[PDB]
Amino acid sequence: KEGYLVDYHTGCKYTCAKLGDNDYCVRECRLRYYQSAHGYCYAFACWCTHLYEQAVVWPLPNKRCK
Numbered sequence: 231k232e233g234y235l236v237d238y239h240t241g242c243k244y245t246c247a248k249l250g251d252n253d254y255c256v257r258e259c260r261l262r263y264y265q266s267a268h269g270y271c272y273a274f275a276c277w278c279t280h281l282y283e284q285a286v287v288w289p290l291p292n293k294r295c296k
């Protein structure tokens with residue numbers, strides 16, 4: 231499973247270096263979910279990958295950047 235990185239209360243994106251320069255992005259994904267998560271910087275913003283069924287993202291109730 232895959233999903234865009236967003237905060238549960240701030241509703242905002244998490245920006246990073248181009249695509250595969252994912253060194254900051256993987257460290258968010260593996261602390262947001264289980265440590266077995268992964269990700270990359272799709273359009274210079276973090277996109278988590280190799281995820282379980284318990285990842286959700288867009289079905290959140292608000293998710294607009296405060």
